[model samples]
Target: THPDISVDVLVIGAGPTGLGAAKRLNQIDGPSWMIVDSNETPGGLASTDVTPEGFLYDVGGHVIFSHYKYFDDCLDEALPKEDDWYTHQRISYVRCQGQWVPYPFQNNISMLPKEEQVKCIDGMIDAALEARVANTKPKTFDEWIVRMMGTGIADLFMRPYNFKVWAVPTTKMQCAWLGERVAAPNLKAVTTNVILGKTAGNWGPNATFRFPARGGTGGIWIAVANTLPKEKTRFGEKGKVTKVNANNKTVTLQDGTTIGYKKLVSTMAVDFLAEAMNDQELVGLTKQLFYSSTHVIGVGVRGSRPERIGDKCWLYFPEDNCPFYAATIFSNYSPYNQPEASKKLPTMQLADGSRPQSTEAKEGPYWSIMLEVSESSMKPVNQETILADCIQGLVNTEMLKPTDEIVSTYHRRFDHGYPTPTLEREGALTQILPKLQDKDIWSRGRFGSWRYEVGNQDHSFMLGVEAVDNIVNGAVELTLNYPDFVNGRQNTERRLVDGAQVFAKSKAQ
Candidate 1:
């Protein structure tokens, strides 16, 4: 009666990270393990929600751009059928001064008005000249932006856009997480493009991506969870972790049952984990980790996909015409993302907040857009009017006409949405993470380790997989420890089908 149950490994939070741990444990067949999630379903931050009117929205914009073959293999295994996924070319852009500029906006200043182009090019030339004598790395994200694209581009696009996205000033953030996430414009090529009156083509890792054919982003995780042994996984209220006694190696659930484990892999937010551990030191360390809240607003319109929004995956907004920093053409991701044309739904209101011509049920095609707005102590949001504000923003952006019938509206906020990469983040994580590991706890995930660089689905998943490997075989956790190393090249060391057998045999030795 001292302990309700026991396992060699216990995983908390059945998101990509936790699921990866469970999958590896099952494959190894070396350690008894169990996974628990507070949510009734899996997916954590990567989950999807559906409106009663039949439109689907992901927590935010999530596109799978994997760096590891192991991650690819796992997803392939879960979503086996080719028909289960739809691949699309990444059609992204930036909205500036009422004009559409190709992504990597700095590279396409040619699209701007001639006077604006001159200002940008003049600054870029000055920045290029200054680089000759530069002997030190950029101290902050703002410094990096100015160094890379000059003050014109930084002020016109990078500064304002990032402020809206991160909900923090660039000076307050660090520059180390840049990696491949931002495309640094080539001075010569940008000048050439401007002279030739041309725009740059697709640039970046996510030039193409895949989405689930059904059930939205959450569907992928739910399917992955299904492949594991049902008895070994717990969700909902019973799975809620109420306390973590690190000294005793036990976790108490909300239902009052205690589960004992040899090693614990916690994927929940580090701040929350610290509280559950009841460790005063850990709690204090987490206070230094800063993050912003994300407000995901979605609008479903009763009409076909608009011509202007054709084939576009997502668009960035740098101007004040909209409260959101980015918007995704959610309906373009999948047909199932919205209700079938035959399905009928009553009009909620017109796009401009006017009463619909008819409140009666309507039929035919639908399209949807999902917007993301960031909020922190520095940037407070009016929650009561955010939904209405976003809808009006769509109109201002010309994505929606005033008379467009609105069928569905969604607004949900995630407190720990983005782990901020502040100047003090590295110092805080350096102290906090190793301290937890000393207590036999591997805190890893988006918010677990509080690393925005390694917080995507693939990176988060590999963090868990590598943590299990480190526990069982003393292998180095590359994704967690060496973000640049793993991100710089294709990680093919672990394969889903063949590597498992090899790893199992190697462990035996």
Candidate 2:
């Protein structure tokens, strides 16, 4: 039987952004719609993956602290039971002086040796005076950091740390995209806090978060998908959307099925969408949009969790000893994150590039770790050595022993991991987004819009909902257009009903 479908709307990609479009279209109940993904499940960047063994990892350490009531309503509906989730406090740190320095390493210079502490404090004081006297703004992010924290903190943490995270040197980045995420040091308060041994709390919206009891982060998205009818979703062979002819508002799939729609929502990477359109001008313009690749590696060990690791949710590294930019203690996020005592898996290798002599089946109450590495044209990486480099980084940071036995390993490379905030980003988006919307097209989500400032699950979902709202009633998308304003204020539609501590421990908490 030939499957020919006609619908009012066609949504491409089932990730957060595409799902957002589908959710809104479904909510409005005006036109029939179908959601499709290249993969079987949803959760673009926010999804989770489990290993051949039992260890689990998120796309790149996704934590959901929402700014939208719509996202909350959908998620709560997906995970309705209290026991369906486990909430944890955020315990993040940086590796410094062979010790775990509480995060915002700039404000905690007291952990450094006496001389280094004095240097940081002196720089902070100088920076404060300069800010008051300066007439013009710093042009580049590198310049802004030097003026905000002075040379000491910039060299010790800011420069090297950001390089790891972004995989591009700070000099190449523009400061405008920073939003409120970057914490500038307060001279008086930082000096006093350091001297008083006052460690600031994990002070962000996601400082504490709730994870699904099972199925990693992807489970939440898939379960939410369950709320919608399965027949409306195109999975596996039913998906495979091969071409989109905008002139006729028709999509051709690989299985010879044709879908026609009045409205179109694309949640795929903008580059892919442009390619699908076969529009020469759009494709050429999309090439100007840049992105970095990410290699996500997971390590499952066969030992008691280290006290030094100590319930740390995630850790950042800057030095050359390791290849990874960040490492998350995946096991700490949920009890079901790792294998039970019975799942059998092979040991890949040890941290030091040596084979384990005793390759026997092992049992655990196990713990798992996940690491990420970034790659861009300006910051090319040795892809082959990344996994090994990560393990060595673990040892260099003293998070793992050189001899730690590994029970499971996972490695994947995502081509469009992060949307780089080049000096050209905002100006480019102004043209790209509207031009598409003019064609009865809604392009949104993490990679969909390619705006990292609003790329989170909550923000991504809201982007979808708001796009629908705008389509239906001409509402404003504050998060997409005015990020600083949205980030500066509390999004009141959803309250912290679960009573998580990330917000409570925050300075603004």
Candidate 3:
């Protein structure tokens, strides 16, 4: 007798996507299913880590601005109590030309020097005039930026800031991934603001967002996993998938166990999944996908929160003064983000990297800043010195004083960070995804489907949910196929408490 596990659907990786599938599957009570991940803990890249000295840093900036009600209901169900979360108003800015410019820098040129403001307004007017006569949409991100805000704003803010964030030239990225993500400078408002010497208020979806009160961003996912049946989840070494035998419709685990599935939903990077499948053709097809690496550097300083850094949530860096593109005031999100003042820890060094005046243990009303640095073959980062470089950058940008004692430091690199929305990405995904699907495999997630526009936490979760719907009831995969359509509107049809009605309607359709 053969001793092998079998299921109607096998999902890989326990990140948002995988957990979403598991959550939906459990709710449906139809197909037998299981979720597996290599990490001992859940929340793949979304997870948070704590330095030995006691400061918490998320993988990068993770804020929940949902476009779907189902996503909201699920997370709310996971961390239901109001006290479990902390809501923060987005107090964001950009660091440029030795000044803090209100965010959406194009709309806030009034904050800049007179000459710089004029330069930006002149370009915006030209861009506005040109758009009236232009027929075709912008093909590349760079072109879209220039057309939307003119070359002055593009060069001053968009270009440098984006290059630092994506680690790839804007010229190489497609513009379609940008839906409501980038704020277009309103010609009238911008001109009036420039004339009146005023700045625009918060202007995007993430103007306000909620964070888990205790465990950081990762805590939400960990709590979500706990809601699922424990027996159905295999995490850690036992859950590590080693091979995907598409021909046999089976997956082999690291522990030498084989799992057979009629349908597969893979949340790992498609490139990695192709390699695991050991399919030469799929491997060749996935070669076209490109991604940038993320280096998350956290700095913990011993002192009271400085007035200069008061209440700011995150700040953008488009200048050479900082190696990082963005920095989050991590401690501002929650008091629990850092160790309590009573907890004593030794000073590692000063912000300037000199020996601390006293290496002895100290109490701290500590504050923390989390920085993100992107890397690609085009824009390489020196990993060995990134921590030191980031610290120096803080001093250069006036974020840290030379004498501020550094109590905690963290540096980690996630190889598959921002999924690059290149001009060639769509073509590669179209061919690669369907080819695998033909073999009953559905590769979908941030890196799985490789669509950055639909790669937020909500979108990724819905990708898995829709994939399950497609597999079970032949429903249209709205999130996977129509990112723009979904992102442009709120999806209120499905609720966690009563999804059956929605499913029935979809089935009827």
Looking at model 2, residue 473 earns an lDDT score of: 60
Q: lDDT of each prediction vs. the true structure? A: 0.87, 0.77, 0.86
Task: TM-score winner between 2 and 3, please give it.
Answer: 3
The alpha-carbon deviation from the true structure for residue 221 of candidate 2, after best TM-score superposition, in angstroms, is 0.8
lDDT, candidate 1, 417-449, per-residue tens: 899899989898899999878888898988887
lDDT (tens digit, per residue) of candidate 3 on 1-509: 34389988998988788778888888786899999999988888878899988899998858878888888888889887879988877788889998998776766787788998888888988999998899899889899889988977888888999999999888998888775887766799888777788756678778777889999988888989898888888997899988887888888888988889888999888999989989878888898787899888887888899979998888999887878999999999999999998988888998888999897988858998998999999999886888889999999999988888989999888888888899898888888999988898888889988887888877888888888878887888889998778888988886676757576778997
lDDT agreement of model 2 with the native? 0.77
Q: Rank the candidates by TM-score, best first.
A: 1, 3, 2
Residue pairs with backbone overlap in model 2 = 48-218
TM-score of 1: 0.97
Q: What's the count of clashing pairs in each model shown?
A: 0, 1, 0
Comparing 1 with 2 on lDDT, the higher-scoring candidate is 1
Candidate with best lDDT? 1
Stretches of candidate 3 off by over 4 Å are 1-3, 499-509
Candidate order (lDDT): 1, 3, 2
